[PDB]
């Protein structure tokens, strides 16, 4: 980064120290990417590793949030070079510590499986007891691959359980074996209650998965009930996340005809004229996969139908080549008089201050 500063990052698990240039103005995820790239892939479950602020002069130890800016956590000036740690995301306990053996018992394969079964069967009060004893909720069921928080997100009216797990020291950004967070998992299940509580408990709606896809992006892939999509956008969720082929949220929504999702995305700032590797806009994908209802929404909301991709095809021409003659008639027939700009400005929650300055 242009304003980048030099930070000494020690990986205790690899017994390595790496001095790296990190962008304070960039988000923590950016900085984490630089550490992992420097590691030459030496870590197992690397995604559940995070940069850690060492305890100093009374101030407690904590993990940097991936979706916060690096400069939001000021560095200690005790060292000549600012020092951060890369560690596995285990529960942060208080200075006061429980018996060493009493832990080894609590965290046996059998005991952990029993604990996950309590969460699965929504036994909130028993879950709370084991957390009070000092069980670390940040682990994976081997067969299932799911952490307790990811399982809790699946259950209906799970707010009770989610609060208890977060109080018991479960990480909100703890990823499952496959790299999804509890926020990803809530959205996939279309569980509005679970998602709202995670956001309420300090969770960011912009948590990235293995491929860097956001929960908003997952909702556009999955379609169905559009409530979770709106809740993420209401939470100032980030827009214009793209996969390897450059598809944005509207691109995926147009392909599977998720018209409610398209409408929410458009309303909250989605760039209609954005194009993927091929140069195709949402309207191009709408023509390719014969999504007449999605196509109408784009056209209605002012989408340019003269846009030509890198094969020099308009959406009209893509439809013709695909065989969707009725859809091409809709696109050719459409006129600027038919376009309706959005009535009113979108509404956002006041859950957290926006990353970066305000004058």
């Amino acid at each position: 980064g242009a304003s980048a500063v030099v930070v000494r990052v020690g990986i205790p698990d690899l017994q390595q120290t790496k001095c790296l240039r990190l962008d304070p103005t960039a988000p923590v995820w950016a900085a984490k990417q630089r550490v992992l790239c420097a590691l030459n892939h030496s870590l197992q479950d690397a995604l559940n590793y995070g940069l850690f602020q060492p305890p100093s002069r009374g101030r407690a130890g904590k993990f940097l949030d991936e979706e916060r800016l690096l400069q939001d956590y000021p560095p200690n000036l005790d060292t000549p070079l600012p020092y951060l740690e890369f560690r596995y995301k285990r529960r942060v306990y208080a200075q006061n510590l429980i018996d060493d053996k009493q832990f080894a018992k609590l965290h046996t394969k059998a005991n952990l499986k029993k604990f996950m079964d309590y969460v699965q069967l929504h036994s909130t009060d028993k879950v709370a007891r084991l957390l009070d004893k000092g069980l670390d909720p940040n682990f994976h069921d081997p067969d299932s691959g799911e952490c307790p928080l990811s399982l809790a997100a699946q259950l209906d009216n799970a707010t009770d359980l989610l609060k208890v797990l977060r109080n018991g020291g479960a990480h909100l950004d703890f990823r499952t074996r496959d790299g999804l967070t509890a926020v990803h998992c809530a959205t996939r299940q279309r569980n509005a209650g679970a998602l709202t509580t995670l956001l309420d408990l300090g969770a960011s709606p912009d948590y990235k998965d293995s491929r860097g896809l956001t929960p908003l992006y997952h909702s556009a892939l999955g379609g169905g009930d559009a409530r979770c999509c709106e809740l993420l956008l209401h939470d100032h969720a980030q827009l214009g996340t793209t996969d390897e082929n450059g598809w944005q949220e509207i691109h995926q929504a147009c392909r599977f005809g998720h018209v409610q999702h398209l409408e929410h995305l458009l309303f909250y700032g989605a760039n209609m004229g954005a194009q993927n590797a091929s140069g195709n806009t949402a309207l191009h994908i709408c023509a390719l996969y014969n999504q007449e209802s999605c196509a109408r929404v784009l056209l209605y909301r002012g989408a340019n139908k003269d846009v030509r991709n890198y094969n020099s095809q308009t959406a009209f021409q893509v439809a013709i080549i695909a065989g969707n003659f009725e859809l091409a008639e809709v696109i050719k027939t459409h006129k600027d008089s038919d376009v309706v700009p959005f009535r009113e400005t979108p509404s956002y929650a006041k859950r957290r201050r926006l990353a970066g300055p305000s004058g």
Binding site: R59, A94, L201, G202, R352
Partner: protein, 168 residues
């Protein structure tokens, strides 16, 4: 064996929660303003000739997270509600915080202190001491203090008072 005291500092952004807590624990006042996501401080002190372990939670004035805010409230043994004498808005906000603590705790009595910070800046003062005392009286005659993290006025008394109240 030492008794643990879990204290929470709540207020609107910029009131001086971090500066108060850091002055108490580290004996440093910082002019620079860095918004607080979340912070925990631990300090050992002697109150009523007894060794006490204070766990102080420094909250974010600017962020709101109701599930987290209720979890701070559920865990906290004692609460310091900080306002700026210079900023009227911060004083106004405290009434709702009071009622939220009582609702979560599910009891009318919770160890608590009303703190008027930035008392060194008399020229900038927009809130009267009487206003604070009047509000404190409304709150079942709750403890009230005017304090300056910069000038080290009433910083130690805030945390000492909370420990006394928890002990009773």
């Amino acid at each position: 064996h030492m008794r643990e005291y879990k204290l929470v500092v709540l207020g609107s952004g910029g009131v001086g929660k971090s500066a108060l807590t850091v002055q108490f624990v580290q004996g440093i006042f910082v002019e620079k303003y860095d918004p607080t996501i979340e912070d925990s401080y631990r300090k050992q002190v002697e109150v009523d000739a007894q060794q006490c372990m204070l766990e102080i939670l420094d909250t974010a004035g600017t962020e709101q997270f109701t599930a987290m805010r209720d979890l701070y409230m559920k865990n906290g043994q004692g609460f310091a509600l900080v306002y700026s004498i210079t900023a009227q808005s911060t004083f106004n906000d405290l009434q709702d915080l009071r009622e939220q603590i009582l609702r979560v705790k599910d009891t009318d009595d919770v160890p608590m202190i009303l703190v008027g910070n930035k008392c060194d800046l008399e020229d900038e003062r927009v809130v009267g001491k009487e206003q604070g005392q009047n509000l404190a009286r409304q709150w079942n005659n709750c403890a009230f203090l005017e304090s300056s993290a910069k000038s080290k006025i009433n910083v130690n008394e805030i945390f000492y008072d909370l420990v006394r109240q928890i002990n009773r």
